[PDB]
Structures are given as structure tokens and as C-alpha cells.
Amino acid sequence: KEQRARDLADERSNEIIRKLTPEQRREALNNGTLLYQDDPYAMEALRVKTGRNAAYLVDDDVMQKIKEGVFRTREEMEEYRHSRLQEGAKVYAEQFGIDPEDVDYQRGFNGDITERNISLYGAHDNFLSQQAQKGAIMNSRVELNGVLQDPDMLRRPDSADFFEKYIDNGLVTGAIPSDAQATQLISQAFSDASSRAGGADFLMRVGDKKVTLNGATTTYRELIGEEQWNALMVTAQRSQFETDAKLNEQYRLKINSALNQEDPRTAWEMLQGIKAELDKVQPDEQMTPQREWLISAQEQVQNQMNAWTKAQAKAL
Amino acid sequence: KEQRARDLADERSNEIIRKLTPEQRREALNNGTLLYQDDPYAMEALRVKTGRNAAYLVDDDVMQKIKEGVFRTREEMEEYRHSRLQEGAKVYAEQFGIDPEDVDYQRGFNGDITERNISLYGAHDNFLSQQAQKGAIMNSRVELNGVLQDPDMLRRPDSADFFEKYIDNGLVTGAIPSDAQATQLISQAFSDASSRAGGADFLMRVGDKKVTLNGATTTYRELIGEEQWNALMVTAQRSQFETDAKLNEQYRLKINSALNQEDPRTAWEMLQGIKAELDKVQPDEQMTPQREWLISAQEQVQNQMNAWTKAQAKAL
Amino acid sequence: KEQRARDLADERSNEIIRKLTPEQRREALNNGTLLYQDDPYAMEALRVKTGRNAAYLVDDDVMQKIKEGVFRTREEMEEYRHSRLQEGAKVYAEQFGIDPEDVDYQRGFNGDITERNISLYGAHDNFLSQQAQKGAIMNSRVELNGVLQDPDMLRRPDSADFFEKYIDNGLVTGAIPSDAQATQLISQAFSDASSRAGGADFLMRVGDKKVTLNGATTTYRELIGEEQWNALMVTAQRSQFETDAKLNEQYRLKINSALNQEDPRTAWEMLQGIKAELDKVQPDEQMTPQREWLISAQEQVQNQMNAWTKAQAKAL
Amino acid sequence: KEQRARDLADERSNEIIRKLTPEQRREALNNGTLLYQDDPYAMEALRVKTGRNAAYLVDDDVMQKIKEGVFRTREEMEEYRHSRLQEGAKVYAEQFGIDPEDVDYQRGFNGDITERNISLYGAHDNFLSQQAQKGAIMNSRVELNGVLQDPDMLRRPDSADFFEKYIDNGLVTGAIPSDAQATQLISQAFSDASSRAGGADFLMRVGDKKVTLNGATTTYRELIGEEQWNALMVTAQRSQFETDAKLNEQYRLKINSALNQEDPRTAWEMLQGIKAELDKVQPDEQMTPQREWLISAQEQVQNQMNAWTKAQAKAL
Amino acid sequence: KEQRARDLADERSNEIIRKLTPEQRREALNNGTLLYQDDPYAMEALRVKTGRNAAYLVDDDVMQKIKEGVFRTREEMEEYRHSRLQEGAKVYAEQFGIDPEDVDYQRGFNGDITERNISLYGAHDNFLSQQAQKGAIMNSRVELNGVLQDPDMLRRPDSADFFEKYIDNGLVTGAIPSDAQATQLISQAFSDASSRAGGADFLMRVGDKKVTLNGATTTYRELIGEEQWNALMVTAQRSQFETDAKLNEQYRLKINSALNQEDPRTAWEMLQGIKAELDKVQPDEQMTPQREWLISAQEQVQNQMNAWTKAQAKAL
Amino acid sequence: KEQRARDLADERSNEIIRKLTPEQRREALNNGTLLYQDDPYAMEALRVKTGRNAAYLVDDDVMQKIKEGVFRTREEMEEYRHSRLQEGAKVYAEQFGIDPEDVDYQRGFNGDITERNISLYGAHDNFLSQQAQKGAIMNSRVELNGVLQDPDMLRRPDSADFFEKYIDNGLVTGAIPSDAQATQLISQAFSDASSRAGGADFLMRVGDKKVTLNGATTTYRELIGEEQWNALMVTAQRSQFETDAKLNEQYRLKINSALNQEDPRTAWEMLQGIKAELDKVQPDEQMTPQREWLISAQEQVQNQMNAWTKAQAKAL
């Protein structure tokens, strides 16, 4: 009848653990006034259950602090796990009035230990891989910003060579492991060099190197779509004029001074000089809001030249 | 044949619990007119089932009030759980006409108690972690707004030092636990200091400190993307002119007064003084809608100077 | 061999229930021409199966009308459940030609009854919690619109006090249970008071009270982000000028009349009076499309004053 | 050893069903050249397996035509199910060279029949509920468009009463069952009456009735947010001027004719008459792109009156 | 002890399959130097396991080429499945050094064959249904573009009749099976006829037919929302002027020529003729960017007529 | 009693593995001071468990480096798997102080090996299929950019033929396997040829070929929607004027020079020549921002001709 006596023990344990709080049970355990203190199987089931509770509490605490990143390395999470296991076993046994040594309590508190450790290791390893991915992305930007932040070092004809060599090495050696993440790294380095001085030269020079990604081998200008390339180039050429306000003032004032000369024939030469100087800070031939400035200036200077030639007949 | 008599008991219990409402059964239990009142196993199965029902009802009530946050601490949820367990056992037993003490009713009402407590503790701990995350985010904004709300204390050269020290400490000690959430905290503090007076100085000064995030160590200007940094700086420099309307009026009226002098030579000096004063409320060199005001003013004053010099020849 | 005879009964039942429609079986049951009418175990399996079918049909009907909200309270869903159980058992037994009393049919139709009731109670309680949430959100707007709809009662200096007291009470007592939903309630009440007359005063006064949310305690202006606060204030100050068209006409016509006086010196006083009156319907100092009206008016009146002073020399 | 002989039968069946196509097996079944034709248990396992295949094929066909809606009612799906069951059993048995009557084939083809019928009924009932929801939404728009499409019947003071009575009845009786869907119905009827002639009157009149939704009772203007109400009213007042181009022409030409009179004093009266007539096609006081037309007209007529009064002094 | 000897065989098999590569095992199988070559149960377990591996490899290959569509019909997928099964069994047995005939290898390679075939048939049938849906959508556009692409056949008064008859037939017969997809077909055919010449007539004529969808029966203008209908009509009337640039030139030049006549009285007649001709290429009364052209033209011609009448007094 | 002695062994193993760290256990294993060193079953359970741990650690490492792509081919992943299995077994056994040969440790470390290999092969094959898809997409762009990048080779009348032949072949042979991905390939090749010089001719010529996709056969202009086709054509015709700024300058300056001649009669001929030349770089008749330039030019030249004809009467 051992199958029945233990079966009734489970019911008595459930009644004990429902009808009382974690406090009243301790107050009544030393007073010998529980509902089934006499039956030993009832107390045994109550102990083996009140341990599986504390095990889940400490595991939930650790898993919850793992989910949102509070453990960076792996050894720190294991250390916190061990310390919390020990301290929590002790403190929950003390709170529930149970001896933290009685074998039955541990059969529940240690019930399924390897599988719970597997679960925690899996979740924390997922988070660690995620932060290592994010850290590679954030790190390979500082390494580039060592020789790509200087607006003078950028436009040298070797910066494209350094960038291509860096992607090639970090893709072959292992510095940039994920071939899928090389796209994010490339796009981030571009958007950086896009909205920074002189970036137009660097982009127009790097747009013809060779980079391997996902089996097929192509050219950078062909990796990202052609329309995406045109938009990126337009942004990289508007950068210098939306980042260094002084240059905007200089070119607008010089366009105005050229447009406002008395003899338009010299205004043509001044506008031509302005465009010749502006081609050296916007090499690629895309249309930017500045070529439109030159368009309006040439429009107005041509109208002025027409008017001045028509009014020159009155000098006859 | 014990395997069959109890098997028929389950069928009779199911017929009893389907063919009647929670009201008619009470009216008919004291009248001795149930469908299988004679068979004891039928009544036993009906009782052990009508308890697993009330258990799920009270558990669903508590879990439903846990899902959407009504319990802030953990002790309050446990207290409500215990009170509802007791009161619900009593009231559902009374409604279904069953004795709230008969052992069979409790074998169902207490059937799987530790696992249901595990489920509730897990859900409520998930919610508690979420609200603690949100509370850390909302709290580390008030602590910053103690020495970053004053538009005069902000532009001092030590505010950047205090901000860097705060992030470093709260990231090393534990005040800001989640390395992943430090990004949200940083972005929120920036967007705060972005659209507030004097914020341009604070941003341009903090953009060169050191902050560690996700293993790699970088500079704040390099943490968020360079184009994101330029957009943030443009917003932080348009802030003062989209928050204190009086300053907008002052600069627009002074630009107009400068532009409308009779001798443009003094208008050049007035516009230069305006730009010199404006550089002290917009330090970084990004292009804002105000440098465009100065551009238009210089354009028009140069046109006026050209016209006045051309009409000066008539004084000969 | 009882394990085999019943095993063949299941196969015969499956063949019966596949090879016939719910109609032909009734026509052939009273004609004694089924495929295995002779074997009693075959008919028993066919009955215990054709009941589990109708049980699922009625349960699917009830669950489907529960999923999309057709039952508001809980007692109404239970009542509909009971009536549909009875009527559906009867009608499906009648359609399938089976006696609605034969014990075997009920062993299938009542097979797993408590678990299906658990499922329905869970789904309907989920929906009931959702509608109670939505109803609290929609209800705490009418209670506010009792003393916040009057454009005159709003701008009194006590409306902010009433709003703060209401949130505090409803957050402590229980009228507004979900601390997470207090954000939705606050944002909704604001957006209401935002786009309504006089709302600027109410917002600028409430932006310095104290509200507790998620453990940390802050000020309303700091709960929602500072840039969000500036946008909300701009909207609340453009409200009065995008809701009462008459006021727009009044201020635009008065600005025009001021700008079009013959002696600009009085136009300065008129514009100053206009701005002084306008500060009382837009207290906070944010930039709105109306301060821009005053900016353009002052620009043009200053140009006119300059022109009139320059042409005053001809009076000498 | 019956546990082993059948165990080897499963392996032989798997080898038979892998090593051959549905065609070669038929060609080789009548030639007596299968791999294990001698063993009867092998053939029995092959038959009981080759039936569970065809069962899944026909079930997948029916479930796939159910998923994307091809069965509107429920009886049509059941009819197609039955016809396909019969025809598919026959045709798949014929293709696989198996007798469509041999009991073993049916033990597999009819293996789990009630559960598969449960699955199909559940999926098809889900789809039927979805289309009934969509049909209620689409139907309660035609019923409204019977007395809300006429641009003359709409602006009568009883249309709001009819709309409120309709929502109240259909929400109490059952014509509009889902309290959650009443929001969609209300918003759809509004957006209809929004962008249609005279809709402004209907909206401004219905915005003060009583509608119950989700326990709490409010007013229509308070059901949808106040800013949403202002946007909806602006759209409903721009409707008439973005739907009947003739009226746009009429008002623009009349504004121009008023603005272009020789004596502005009569132009004031003409513009006042225009605004008085326009208030009857835009009752609520929200700002629309048309009040802005009147604003510009009054601006220009005031400038013209000022100029004409200033030039009247030359008549002295 | 048969339960233990085989139990140790599983462990030895696992050690064999972990401690070696798919290459070393073949090199060591013919050299008689495996770790447990002596024990027959070890080799048997190793064989029954190394088959379940190859089975999963070939199944994963086929399922992976099924997931992303490479098999259009069903017979092609079955053919590829069979060929790959045979060839893969042979080649994997050869690579792993196992006889491709030994019964134990097949007990693993053919282990669960019917269920894997069920899985593949289900996935491929899902994809086939998806492509049949997409193909019906793409096909019922070519059939319409046979009598709806001609800009002259479209505006005939029977095109609406053909479209309504087509939807009705294809919805009753079965050419357009999914009542849910009839919405996509209708919207696609509209958007086609929207941005194409003469489409305005076709839309304004079809907007009053009858189409049944989801139980309820409505009119096309009421199927899609009224505001959606107005937007669609505006697009369909701007189509002709955003697709055939020549017509844009013609109307703009003629508007200019009318506006620039010397006597405005004839300009009124010219503009009236232009509007009368334009009503035949934009029947419905919605406001388009072209009625605005006529509005500006009438505005300017009325101003010119006023000026010319005022200057006519000087002819007295 | 063998069922109990091993049952206690599991509890003792769990206590051992909870109460100690991976370090203390090694220090105490050689000192003979574990908690249950005496019992052999306890040590056996501890060993069989401490192996299932290391197995999961190495499997999680490999699966985590597989999830985010670090293994391109399949043989490389298998090689890394094998090397890590060996090295990890050895190193984890050494760290946990267990003999890396004792049979019990391997019964846990090799516990479920074939299923874990199945899981890894499945995940890595999913990733490999994804990268092969992306590689086909990226590769069939370089192959096209060999004869579609030259702005002169593109506008030849055979480029459309080559493109159609390429899609047809790669869809029949297998170079472009996924019929679903042919849409992505087509759209990408178009968007490439869209925003590149001369692309208008290529698009307007390819828009009438034949391509089969998803059973139904249509024309390219009908594959993508007609409104999508019009938008794509507008973009392809604005490309040349938003990519080669020199051409923008040329046409704007020539339009200005034509508009500014003294005798408008020659300006008509100049504008007509400009439009005739512009039709050869924008063949399709869609409306672009350039036809609007010609519209404004013709508008202004017609106004000028009217003014000059009206002022010609003064020459009489």
C-alpha cells in the first residue's frame, strides 16, 4: 500500500502549503501545531516541495538578471550563480523554518540542477554573443576613426587602399568574423565617411575596389544598390556644406560678389573660377544643392549680360 | 475491477458537471436529487473536479491582475495571493454547495500548487524586472536634471566632467546595471540636454570624453553615429531659438535693423558683431537655420553696398 | 483478447465515420443497414466518437464568440455556455441519429469537460481584463472632462491641483490600478487639454507638480521627455489658433491694421499692445506660428519706419 | 516473439516505401516482384502506411483550400470534405495499386479521423468568424448609406438621432455584436460622412449624443480623442471643397470679384456676405483652408482701403 | 540481461560517432581498428545511427530547396525527392564506409519515412498554394489588360459592364476562388485603370454596379471607403496629366494663350471653352491640380478685365 | 532495491554539483574530501552529469558561432565541430578533475550525439541556404553590370533582348532557381538601370518582352503594377538629370539663352530644338521635372511674344 500512503502525503503537503503563509508555517513548526505534523510522509512531501520552490526563486532571480545584461563575462555569471545558490538555499530554508541540511529539502532544491544550469548557460551565452556582436561593430569604428577622422588624411589616395585591405584582412583572418555583419560594418563606416569633410573623395575612390561577401565577389559600388550609391554620394557631397558653416558663408558670399559685378563678362570668369574651385570639394558628378546655386548664378548673370548688351546699343 | 468502477465514476462526474449550472447543483445537493448521488465514487470525482475548477478561477484572477501591473513589490503580490486563495476556496466551495473542508475537494483545489506558484512568481518577477528597468531609466533622469536643468549651470566646463563621471560610476558600481540600457540612458540625457538652453556647449564639450560600452571603449561622439551626432548638434543649436521666443525676436529685429542702415559700411560691422555674439550661443560649426539668416543678411547688405557704390558715381 | 476486439472496434468506427455523411447515417441507422451494426463494440466506439465531435463543435462556437467580444460580464458567458451545451448536445445527437441519453454518447460528449471549461474561462477572462483596461482608460477621460472641458474652468490656478490630486488618489486607492496604464491616462488627458482652449495655462501650471510612477518619483515635465514637452507645449499653444477661427481672424486683422498705419511710431505701440495681449493666451515662451506673425509685423514696421525717417529729410 | 516479427515488418515496410515510387510499386505489385511480397506482415505494414499517406494528402488539400477562403458556409465545406474523402481514398488506393477495400488500408486511411475533422472544423470556423466580422463591417455601411448618402438628407437635424438610435439598437439587440468592433463601425461611418457633402453639420450634431462602449458611457466627441475630433472636423469641412470642384470655383471667383471692386467699402460688405454664406457650409469653428482664403481677402481689402483713404487726401 | 548489453551498445556507438570524423572511420573500418569493432551490438548501434544521420541530411536538402521555391508542380518535387533519396542513401553509405545494403543501416535511414514524407508534402503544398494564389492575382491582370489597356476601348460605356460580369462570373464559377483575394484583384485592377488614360470614365461608370463580397452585397463605390474612393478618383483624373506629357503642354500653352489676349472678354470665352473641353477628360467633379489651373486663369483674367474696364474710362 | 540505491545516487550527485564550484571540486577530488566520495553510485551519477554539462557547453559554442554566420561552407563547420568536440571533451574533463577516458563521463558527454548533430546540421544548412540566396542575388547583379554599366551599350536595341534571354535561361536552366526570387532580381536590375544614364531607353524597350513567373505568363510592364511602372519610368528619366550635373547645367543654360533672345520668334525655334533634342534622352512620354522646365520656358516666351507684338504697334 506504499503507493497510497505517499499519494495521501502529496495531498496533505499541498493542503499545508496552500493553507499557510511562509511566515505562519515557521511560527507553527516550532510550536508543533501544523495540520499534519504527526504523519512523517506529509512532512517529507512538504519539505521536498518547499525546496523546489526556493530553487525556482533563486533561478528566476539569476535568469532575470541575465536576460537584461548585467553579466558581461562568463566567469562573473557563474560566480554570482554559485554565491546566490548557496546564500539562497540557506536563507529560504531559514525563512520557511526548514533545516538547510535535511536531505529531503535538498532533494527538491537540487531536483533538476544540470538542466537548469544548461538553461542559464544557454541564455547567458546568447546574450554574450549578442554583446560581442555589438562590440565588434562598435570597435571596428574606433579602429577606422584613427585614420579616417582627420579631414586631411581622408582625401589622400591611399585611404581607400587601407579600407579595402582592412576589410579583406578582417574578413580572412577573423577580426570581422560574421560575413553577414560585414555589411553593417561597411555601411556604418560609409555613413561615417559620408557626413564628414572630404568624404566625397574617399567614397569616389573606394567605389572601385574589390570586396568578397557571401560567395560572390563584386565591387563596392555594386554591393549597395546603384540608387543607394547615388544617394550616399549626394549626402557625402552635401556633408562639407552642412557641417562647416564657414565654407557655406564663403561660397555664398563669393557667388553673390561675382553675380553683382558691373560688367557681366568678368562675372562669367568669376563664376567659372568658383565652379573650378568647387569641383575640388565635390569630385563626383552627382547633382547637389550647390551645383544648383551655380546654376541660378549663371542664369542670373546671363540675364544681366543680355540686359547690358541690349542697353549697350544706347551708347551708339 | 477497481480500474473500471472509478472509470465509470469519471463519466458520471462529467455528466453531472455538464448537465447542471453552479446554481441548480446547490439547490439539488441538499434535496438529494443529483443524477448519481447514490454512487460514492461519482460524488468523489465530482468533488475532486469542482475543486480544480475553483483553483483555476482564483489563479486566473491573480495572474490576470499580475499581467497588467497591479502589484509593485513582491510581498504585496504574495499577500494578495494568500488572501485570495483562502477567500476563494471558501466562497467557491460555498457556491458549488460543497463542504470547504471535505478532503476530496482539496485534493483538486490544491492539486498542483507548487507549479502554479512557480508560474505566478515567474510572471510577476518578469513584470517586476520590467518596471525596475523603466524606473531606473526614469530615475536617472531626475538625478541628472538636478545639475543639468539650470541653463546657467549647464554651460560650465565641468558639466561634461560630471556627466562622464556619473556614467562611469553608475556603470562600474551598479547604479546603472544594464550595459545595454546605458545606451537608452545616454540618448535620453542627450535629447534632454539637446532641446534646452545652452545645451550646445554641453554637447560639444562632452563629445570628447571616454565611455566604455560592450567591451570596446570609444568616445561619445563615436558611440552614436557621426551623422546622428551632426543631427543631434543641429537640434541642440536650434533648441535655444525654438524654446525662448524672446531671443528669436531679439536676433531677428537686430538683423533687420542692421540690414536697414543707410550706409552699408556700418551694416557690415553690425552684422559682424551679430555673428560674433551668435557664435557664443552656437559654438559648434554645424549649419543651423540661423547661420542662414546671417547668410541672407550678408547677401542683401552686399547687394545694397554694390548699389550704393554704383550710385555714388552720381555724386561726382 | 479484449485488447484486440476493442482495437478492431476503433477501426470499424473510423470506417463508419469516414464512409458516411451526418445525414446518410441517420437514414441508415433506423433501417439497420450500417456497415457494422452487428458488432456492439463498433457501435459503441462510433457513439463515443460522434460525441467528442459535437462537444468540440459547441465548444468552438462558444470560444469563437468569446474571442471577438460578444460577452461583456462573466455570468452572461456562463449562461450562454450552459444553454448551448444543453441545446447542442440534444440537437447534435438528434441530427446524428443517436439517442441523446445513451451513456456511451455522453462519455464522449462529456469526455474532457473541466479542462474545456478552464480554457473558456481563461480566454474570456483575458478578454474581460482587456475590456476593463480599455474601459478604465475611456472612463477616466469623462471624469476629467467634467472639470476640464470648460475653457474657463481650465485656466484657473486650481485645475492643476485637481489633476495632480486625482492621479495621486486614483494611483493610491485603486481607481487607476495599473501603474503602467497611468502613462496612457496622463498622455491622453494631456493631448485632450493640449488641443483645447486655454490649455496652455493648464499645462504650464501642471508641469511642476509631483507624480509617482514605477518606483521613482519625478515631475510631470520630466516624466515625458523634455523635447516631447516642448512639442506638446507648442501644440497646446497653437490649439487656440487652430480651433476657434474667429480669434485667428481677429489677431490677423489687428496685426494688419497696426502694420498699415501712416505713422509707424504708433504702429510700434499697436504691435506692442498686440504682443502684450497675446502673452495672456500663450504663457509659456515656446515658439509658435504666431510669434512668427509678430516677428514679420515688427520686421515690416521697422522697414516702414526706416523709409519714413529717410523720407522725412525731404520735409527740411 | 510477436513483438519482434512485427518490428521487422515495420523496417521492411519502410524499405519498400523508400526504395520505390508510387508508379513502380503498382507495376511490380501485380508482377509479384516486390522486395518482401512473401512476408504477410511486411505487406500489412506497407498497406497501413500507404493509407496514412493518402489520408494526409486529402486532408492537406482540404485544409489548404480552407485556409485561404474558398468555402463560405459550413455545409459546403463539409460536402466538399466528404466528396474528396471518398474520391481520394478510391483514387489513391488505385494509384498505389492497393485494393480500396482491404481492411488494413483503411486502418491507416481512417487512422485518426475524428481529430482531423476537429482540426478542419476549427480552422474553417476561424475563417468563417473572420468573414462574418468583415461582412458585418461591410454590411452596416450599406445600411447607413441608405439615409446618409443623400447630401440633402444628411444635414437634417434628425440624422444624428437616427445614427445614435442605430448604434444603440444594434449594440443592445445584437445587430452589431462585438463591442470591440463598434469602434471600427463608428470610425468607418464617420470617415464616410467626413469626406462627403454636408457632413460637417452631421458631425457637429452627432458629437453630443450618448454611446456606451466597454462598460463606461461617454459622448461621441469624447470617445475618439479631442485632437482626433478636431482633425476629423477639419477634414469634414474641407470635404465639400475637395469633392465638388464647382463650389471651389464659385467661392474663389466671388472672393476675387469682391476683392477687386473700386471702392473697398463695398468690398467689406461683399466679403462679409461671403463669410456669412460660408458659415452655413462649415458650421463648426475649426480652421480650414477656406477661412484662410477669407483672411487673405480681408488682409488685401484692408490694405486697399488704407491706400485709397491715403490717396483720398489728394481730392482735397 | 538483454536490456543492459544493448544499453552499453548505445554508449559505445555514441563514443564511436563522437571520437571520429566521417573520413577516419572509413579508413579505420577496413583496417579493423575501430574502438569497438569486436562487439557486434556496438557496430549495430553505430550503423542504425549513422543512417538516421544521412536520412536527415537528404531530407534537410530537399526541405531546404522546397522552402524557397524551386519546385513548381508537385510531381517534380516527388521526382527530385525519390532521386535524391536513392543517390543520397548510396553516397552517404559509401562515404561513411557502410554497406548500402546491410539491413541495420536501412532501419535508421528508413526509420520514420512516412512522417517525413508527410512533412515535405505539407511544406511543398503550402508553397504551391502560395504560388497559385500569386499566379491567380498576376493572371487575372493580363486577362483584364486585354480589353482595358487600350485607352480608347476603356472609356466605352460597356467596359464597366465587362468588368462587373468578369468579377461576378469568376466569383461564382471559380476562376477567382478566394473571396478574400477578390479585394486584392479589385484594388489591383482599379490602380491599373487609375493611372492610365481615360481611366476616369471607367471608374466613374463602374462605381455604381453590384458586387458581392463576404456575404453582404454592396456597390463598388461603397466597398472601398468613400475617402479612399475620392483619393482614387483624384489619382485617376491626374493620371492623364502625369502620363502623356504632350497633353500637359497643350493645356498649359492654351491656358496661357487665353490668359494673354488683349481683350479679356474673349479670354472669358476661351477659358470657358477650355473648361468645357477639359470636362470630357475628367468627368467626375473631384478637385484636381488642373481645376486649380483654371481657377488661377479665371482669377487673373478677372483681374485683367477689372483693370481694363477701369482704364477704359480714360477713353472718354 | 536497485531502484532506490540509484535513486539516492541522483540526489547525492545533485547535492555535489550544487554545493561546489568547478574549481573546489578538482581541489577536493584528489584530497579525497568530497561529500559522497565513498558511495560509488554517487560518483558515477556525478560523472555522468558533469559530462552532459560539457557536451552542452561545446554544442552551445558551436551553435552560437553557427547562428550568426562564421562558417561559409559545410565542410568547415564539420571540421570546427570535430576539433572543438575533441578539445572541449579533454579540457572540460581536465578542469572538472575527471578522467577524460572513464566510461561514465563519456556516457554523459556522448549522451545524445546524433540528435545534436542533426540540430547543428539543420541550423547551419538554414544559414547556408540564406547566404546562397543572398549570393545569387548579389551575383546576378555583377553579371548584368558587365553589359549594363556602360551608358552607351545600354541604349542599344539589343540590351532588352539580352536581359530577357538571361532571365529566361536562368529561369529554365537553374542559374536563377527561385521563381519567387526572380522578382527581387528583376526589381534590382531595374532600379539599377533606372538610376543610370540612358536607362530610359532600356526600360521603355524591355517593357514589352515576355517573362514567365508563377505559372501565369505576362509582360514586364504588367508584372510590376502600372502605377509602379509609371513611377519607375519617371525615376529613370530623372536619373540622367540627377546624376550627370554637367547635362543639367547645359540644358538650363540653353533654356535661359533661348528664353532671353530679343525676338521671340527665334526663341520659339530654339525651344523647339531644345525639346526635340531632349526627346532623345527621355523617350517615354511620362511627365518629368524637365518637361516642366520646357513648359515654363514656353509660357514665358509666349508672354514675351505677346508683349512684343503689342509694343510693335508703336512702330506704326
From Swiss-Prot, chains A, B, C, D, E, F:
Keyword check for Chaperone: no
GO CC terms, sorted: host cell periplasmic space; virion component
UniProt keyword list: Host periplasm, Viral genome ejection through host cell envelope, Viral penetration into host cytoplasm, Viral short tail ejection system, Virion, Virus entry into host cell
Compartment(s) where it occurs, according to its Swiss-Prot or TrEMBL record: Virion; Host periplasm
GO biological process: symbiont genome ejection through host cell envelope, short tail mechanism
Source organism superkingdom: Viruses
Keyword RNA-binding: no
Function: Component of the cylindrical core that assembles on the inner surface of the capsid during capsid formation and plays a role in viral DNA ejection into the host cell. The inner core is composed of stacked rings of gp14, gp15 and gp16 proteins. Following binding to the host cell surface, the internal core is disassembled and gp15 is ejected along with gp14 and gp16 into the infected cell. Gp15 probably remains associated with gp16.
Assembly and interaction partners: Homooctamer. Interacts with gp16; after ejection the gp15-gp16 complex composed of a gp15 octamer and a gp16 tetramer probably binds both the viral DNA and the host inner membrane. Interacts with gp14.
Family indicated by similarity: Belongs to the T7virus internal virion protein gp15 family.
Protein name from the UniProt record: Internal virion protein gp15
Taxon lineage: Viruses, Duplodnaviria, Heunggongvirae, Uroviricota, Caudoviricetes
Residues of the full protein shown: 59 to 374 of 747
